[PDB]
Amino acid sequence: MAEDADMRNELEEMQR
Amino acid sequence: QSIINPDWNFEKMGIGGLDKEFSDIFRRAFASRVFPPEIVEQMGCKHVKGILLYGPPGCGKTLLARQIGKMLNAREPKVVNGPEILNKYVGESEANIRKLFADAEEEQRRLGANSGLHIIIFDEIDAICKQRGSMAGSTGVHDTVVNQLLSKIDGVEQLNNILVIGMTNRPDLIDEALLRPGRLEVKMEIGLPDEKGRLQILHIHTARMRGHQLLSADVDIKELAVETKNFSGAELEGLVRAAQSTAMNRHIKASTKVEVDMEKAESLQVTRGDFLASLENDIKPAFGTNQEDYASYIMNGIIKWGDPVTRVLDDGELLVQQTKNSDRTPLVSVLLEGPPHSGKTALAAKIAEESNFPFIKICSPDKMIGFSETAKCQAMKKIFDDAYKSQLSCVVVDDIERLLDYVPIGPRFSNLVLQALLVLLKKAPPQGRKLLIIGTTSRKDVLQEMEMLNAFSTTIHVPNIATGEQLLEALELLGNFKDKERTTIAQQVKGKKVWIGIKKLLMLIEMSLQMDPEYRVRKFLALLREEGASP
Amino acid sequence: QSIINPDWNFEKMGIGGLDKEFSDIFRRAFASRVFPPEIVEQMGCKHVKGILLYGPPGCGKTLLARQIGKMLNAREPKVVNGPEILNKYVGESEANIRKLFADAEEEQRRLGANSGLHIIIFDEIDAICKQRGSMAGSTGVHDTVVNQLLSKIDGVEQLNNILVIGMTNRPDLIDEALLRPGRLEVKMEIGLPDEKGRLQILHIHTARMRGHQLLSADVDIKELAVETKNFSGAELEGLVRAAQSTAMNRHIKASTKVEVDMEKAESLQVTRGDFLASLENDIKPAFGTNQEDYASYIMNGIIKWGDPVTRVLDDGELLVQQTKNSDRTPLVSVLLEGPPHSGKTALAAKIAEESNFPFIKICSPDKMIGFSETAKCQAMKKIFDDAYKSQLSCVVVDDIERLLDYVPIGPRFSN
């Protein structure tokens, strides 16, 4: 079984 | 105020070979905006706000986009260079997309109908817009981007002062909802030019040199246009550029210190030899068959050692003319058959070369060594699909018995390839287009057993050398043995019948030549005797 | 200001065996930047903006790129080491690409046609520029990067002050749209050298030693050039390095505390014995040949027990002469047949050894135990592909019936 490929990511910003 | 700059001329934009496409675009897009308004209001139609361009690399799409942008009298166009909208945060890509249409909406709301035009250019549009629901990862942003674009182009609010231009290399990957009328109507294909287009393009890129007297008088443009086949605009420009540098290099010395003459630089001129040299060592097209193929397939040329050689060519010419002229039979086929080592591939290549058709291709097994069965079928289907696109085409299939793996033991062979070939030999191309197929083999009875010899229209036989006179004529035409030795050779062969193939004689002669000068004819005769005969 | 450095000199570069390739590169790339500007203006041509170099390992691509970088009087070149621009956040891998062209665009906008030159180098370009899938459902893992690069090299906005250089070992995987005459126009192959190039390389790498009288008088470089057949540029340097190390090792003693005798270290010299030892044990080429295989296949030598042994060898000599001195027949083949245990695989090995061709390879079933037919076909194709990069090649196919998996029952074999 071929291991799952790499993935991107999504980011969320927070305000102080 | 008109929508075209007063100082605009079609010959100023430097595009050649696309008169029809430009005419169609102008008719479909800008016809409404130039015609007097009152009739348009009476007629009550809406303008068009979408253009798509597709085609193979290096044909002139970006040039068209830039020139169209320069033609119109309006605001400076907005250009997007590929996927420049994507952002790492959430909801920023959609904001970036929405920021493009702000000014258009503001002007529409303020000035209503009496408003200017806004142009937006998307380069590599297939990067951001793809069919929804196909990406396994990171699809959260792509689908949202597509939906935002669709809603903005055509939504509840209506705009009537925007024009969108897109360029792509893969038209079939774009979402269908974006291609319906009302969003992107005018779809255009830009393809390779014909001879007239090549001549126009070549004339465009040599105007300055002629104007300034830097071009020699022995250069003929028409010869170049005729010679340069399958080229595209970029390749023609590259050829001219290489020719220009080959001339500049004759006045520089890069031995130890780079030095220029500057006293012979004046009187610099470009000659025909520069063009010829640049065409054989610098630039090579990336389409179709070229000289490097005929060189390999026809290695030792063709020599008229007898009558049948002319007979075969005169029989092939009749079929070439028939396929060119007739209209009731758009598809024709022929089979060349003969004993081994007779020279069938060379004759087929010669006939195809003299056909002079725009499209020529050769399908041989030596380019598919080690392939499976499906790979072979797929590689054949691709070659046959590209001839349907052209107008009149010719194709060659050599060594059929090797294309399908036949071995006398068993027997054993590939059924899939046989069925694919039997299907393709009776498939006709689209209306108005014509195709010729030539095939070569060395085992007629086997093909007859499989019921393939009745899918061909006619057959041509390629015989062997049969008499000593023909052998002596071939020897004379090759000029390998002198008259004194040829007399001795004739003393032996004239009273006998011979049975030899042309491709074997050239090997026998080479084998004989290695011996010492005294034992050459003797060795040649011994080998010939050993060969025997079996008519 | 001239584009070329005032003090540049060809002999200073230190590259040997590539005089034609460099001439072609110079002519096609820098010819239009040395000529007077007014005449070039009159002709109305644009400059070339691309170079690609491909070939087998160790033949001097990264050296040529670095020297080209150092020979121009311009800014400091930008370098990208393989996939150094990949990132995990969405939309960053493409910002990295767009960040390489900022200075060029700014200078083009400001200074117009009086700008300098900006160079960019892509090492292992095939890692980030593979062909786009172009079929729905197998979209490439990175296609946005390819699209961004294509849009930036040649787009709606025109640049005339850039130059890009790429390097690869697998030129057949690059995207086609990247290699058209408008983007990467000049493509060159760097291959193995010939005898003259080997002499030039050896002189380049021995000049400094010869300067300080550190090289013995019994060393002849022409003989070394003759002996070293089918050696790449790196292997000659490795040979010289090994010889120097062997020479140095004689004045050190390491089986207890490490001491160096600095009284005979001032009479240090390199002899040909070191070179001979190095050629036998340390450096083993890849496209050449070595004597171990012959010892493996001719185990017990060849004895002349009769007349046929001479006839078989004389026929092979004749065939070798024909194949080397012929033009109409560039390919010739022969078959050796006989009863079992007659010793036919040693005679073939002996003929191949006596041919004296630069490239000699033996294909045997001993290295294909348990393989399926596909693997065997792939191995044969690899050997024959390697054989087409030499001016004279000889190949031997051994035990054909064990290669086809023939068995009398049935019969059964691999088609």
Add this chain to the structure above:
Amino acid sequence: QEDYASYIMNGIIKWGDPVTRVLDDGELLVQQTKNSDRTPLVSVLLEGPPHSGKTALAAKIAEESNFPFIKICSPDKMIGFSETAKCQAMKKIFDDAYKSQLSCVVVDDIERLLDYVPIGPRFSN
């Protein structure tokens, strides 16, 4: 709508009685299938020597009827397909045909659809 021009590329000419006889038989079969309730399914086979024009006559017979749904299944589209893809395609075509109240389907070049070769012989079961 099928591209009947491709299959009928040179029209039809009445060079003899058999043409009219075949067309009349086809019309009779169409009428029977249209106006029957005991036999909802009907089948017929056209056979003859090679180069007789069977495909054109079958296409004409199909066209002359005015059924809402008409389709033609040919091996021209199934090039390089496996023995499963063909089954799936035929199943899809018949499933689509089932929806309409009246359906007519044409299967041409049966022997090419089974991959028949007289050596051994061979075919797909």
